[PDB]
């Protein structure tokens, strides 16, 4: 079985295309991230939306960027777009069940309680986040 496994991995582990950030050094990204964050927590959503989009354009693979932009679309009730990014964060970010919990929130709002139900159940089987599991059973219970 082993050389199929590694042939696959070898091909992906060279298909790593760019890291996106066009030699515009790291801790600079951080500062932009920090205002996006400060704009967001402050409720200046239009600015926070520009900053996160700008960061996601620069580095599509950073889960925090994707999660910030997804959170904005969520707050804006652009729920399909939020859920689309949360699926991306999930596929990038692989451990955390947060984007799956937030997708349940989105699917609820997209009139698909069935999908929503599956999300919160997944969080319940796989999360080890106590708080998140509570929230997730709460939603689950509420839509029975």
């Amino acid at each position: 079985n082993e050389s199929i496994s590694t042939a696959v991995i070898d091909a992906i582990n060279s298909g790593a295309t760019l890291k996106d950030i066009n030699a515009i050094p790291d801790d600079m990204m951080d500062d932009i991230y920090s205002y996006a964050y400060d704009f967001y927590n402050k409720g200046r959503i239009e600015e926070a939306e520009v900053f996160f989009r700008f960061l996601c354009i620069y580095d599509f693979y950073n889960v925090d960027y994707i999660m910030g932009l997804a959170a904005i679309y969520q707050i804006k009730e652009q729920f399909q777009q939020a859920a689309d990014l949360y699926a991306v964060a999930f596929a990038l970010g692989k451990n955390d069940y947060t984007p799956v919990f937030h997708t349940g929130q989105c699917q609820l709002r997209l009139k698909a309680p069935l999908k929503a139900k599956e999300c919160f159940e997944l969080v319940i089987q796989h999360s080890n986040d106590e708080k998140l599991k509570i929230k997730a059973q709460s939603y689950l219970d509420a839509i029975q």
Binding site: D27, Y33, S34, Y37, M67, A71, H102
Partner: peptide, 10 residues
């Protein structure tokens, strides 16, 4: 309601 973002500082 409002999702909770990871706090800055790398």
């Amino acid at each position: 309601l409002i999702p909770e973002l990871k706090a800055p500082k790398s």
